[PDB]
Design a protein around this ligand. Structure first.
Ligand SMILES: [Zn+2]
Ligand SMILES: [Zn+2]
Length: 221
């Protein structure tokens, strides 16, 4: 019996949703995403794991008078995408990069209904930006930047104390990608990782340090 979905205000117009999965060897691990409010419209930044929690999340906001306009998933793993099918069934627009949609299909999963490509993509002009730093945690990982509040949702790319699951990682590229991200978002006020506490821009430096070490470990026997 997993802990309940949490929904907590992070800043004006920005909520963190936390859902939970059992990870063998690690206990119950939180997954953080966002909900971003633009006027009367809400956007899910990552879905919870399940259709059920995705519904709870949508219903919490719709009951309060917001209209769910879209979700964007930061990478293909289930902790970002598990609710896509349910959203698609409710005709709620779902977004992922072209590469994320490829890796969803390869993994045997339901795709987002809308895709995009390129280093920079506006989900909502001047409000919600998607940036591709390069491969790291996965080949497709993107981050989401909220310019007005200087909030960066780093997803499973931001890994200040350890890299986590390396199964789908590109460890050769992660340090370059992390250097690029650090160079680009140094004025972030809040940096939101998937699997640890909210911090500030220092999480970009710590992620780079972890990526560098990870690549070194990979070259041992
Ligand atoms: Zn992942
Ligand atoms: Zn993850």
């Amino acid at each position: 019996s997993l802990p309940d979905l949490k929904i907590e205000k992070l800043d004006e117009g920005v909520y963190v949703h936390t859902s939970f999965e059992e990870v063998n060897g690690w206990g119950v691990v939180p997954k953080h995403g966002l909900v971003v409010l633009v006027n009367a419209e809400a956007y899910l930044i990552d879905t919870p794991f399940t259709a059920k929690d995705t519904e709870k999340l949508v219903t919490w906001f719709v009951e309060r008078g917001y209209k769910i306009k879209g979700s964007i998933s930061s990478h293909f793993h289930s902790d970002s995408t598990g609710g896509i099918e349910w959203l698609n069934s409710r005709s709620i627009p779902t977004y992922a990069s072209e590469l994320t949609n490829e890796l969803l299909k390869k993994d045997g999963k339901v795709q987002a209904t809308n895709s995009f490509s390129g280093v920079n993509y506006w989900l909502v002009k001047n409000k919600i930006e998607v940036f591709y730093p390069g491969p790291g945690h996965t080949p497709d990982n993107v981050v989401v930047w909220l310019p007005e509040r200087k909030i960066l949702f780093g997803g499973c790319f931001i890994k200040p104390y350890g890299l986590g699951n390396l199964g789908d990682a590109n460890i050769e590229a992660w340090p370059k990608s992390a250097k690029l991200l650090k160079s680009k978002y140094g004025k972030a006020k809040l940096v939101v990782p998937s699997h640890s506490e909210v911090g500030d821009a220092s999480l970009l430096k710590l992620t780079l340090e972890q990526a560098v070490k990870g690549l070194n470990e990979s070259k041992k026997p």
